[PDB]
Each structure stands twice: as structure tokens, then as C-alpha cells.
Amino acid sequence: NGVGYQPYRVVVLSFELLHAPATVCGPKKSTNLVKNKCVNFNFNGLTGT
Amino acid sequence: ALGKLQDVVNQNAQALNTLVKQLSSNFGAISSVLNDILSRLDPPEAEVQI
Amino acid sequence: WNRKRISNCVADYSVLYNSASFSTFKCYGVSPTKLNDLCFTNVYADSFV
């Protein structure tokens, strides 16, 4: 049949970005804990300085 | 006794507190925090929220 | 539609959206370019054709 009637497979990744302990964290690796100095920190994806 | 002076201090301090509290209002955008709006949208679609 | 919980793991959405197999891939409220470095509390995958 025409593509207009063809079947499309569908998956919906509903990213529930919530303030809670996160589980799926993405590929980026960690860095050693730094303290008492100015650093562009990034915990769980919240970008901060 | 010192109501007029206290009233001046209170009015000025409340006005500053409201100025700081406005920073927590999204104003129609996804979130109040500008850094998260930058870190959860691409620049083309971030600029409208910003 | 079935709902499969995705949690307790690490992900890589770059391969998922880069692959040419997905003629349709639309993100709402997040842009795919930076999905790699932000973590999420829970992700829901709902499959239906």
C-alpha cells in the first residue's frame, strides 16, 4: 500500500526530568571531587559555578 | 516610639525582598533558572525562552 | 501500548538519533544535541505501531 497507510513503529521517550535521585545519567564520565575553590561544577546535569 | 524610622526600614527591606523573589518566577518560560534553560535547549530554541 | 521502565543504567541517545533508520525523530522541550550529558530520574518507553 501507499506510505500514507503504511505502518510506522513508534516509541515515545517521555523524559521525566524531575528533581529526584536520577538514574539514567548519559555517557559523560566523572571527575575527582574538588573543594574550597571556584569550579564550574556539574552534578546530575545541573550546570553551576 | 520610633514608628516612622521603623516604617522606612521595613518599606525599603520589603521592596528588596520582592526584587529577589521575582527571580523565582518563570514569566511564561520553561523554568526560572536561566542555566537549566540553557542546559536543556539548543541555542536557537533557548533564545526565545531567555 | 506497553510501557517499559528504563532506569538503573547509563544511556547513549547519540546513536539513537544519529542512525539514518529513524526518518522521524522529534524532541519536545529538550534538544537532542545535549541529551548525552544530562541525567534523568526516570525514562518511559511506550511502544505502539
Residue B37's nearest CA partner among C13, C12, C31, A40 is: C31
Say which experimental method was used: cryo-EM
> How far is residue B27's CA from residue A40's CA, in Å, rounded to a whole number?
27
- Residue pair A45/A22 in contact by the 8 Å Cβ criterion: yes
**Interatomic CA distance for residues A29 and A43, integer angstroms:** 11
Q: Enumerate the β-bridge partners of residue A48.
A: none
Q: What is the resolution of this structure in A?
A: 3.8
Using an 8 Å Cβ cutoff, are B31 and B37 in contact? yes
A 14-33 residues inside an 8 A Cβ radius of B: 17
Structure letter (DSSP) for residue C21: T
C44 vs B41: CA distance, rounded Å: 20
Tell how many helices (H) and how many strands (E) occur in chain B: 3, 0
Three-state secondary-structure class, residue C44: strand
C 1-49: CB under 8 A from B: 29-31, 33-34, 38
Residue C42 has which C-alpha cell?
526516570
| A26 contacts C33 by C-beta, under 8 angstroms | no
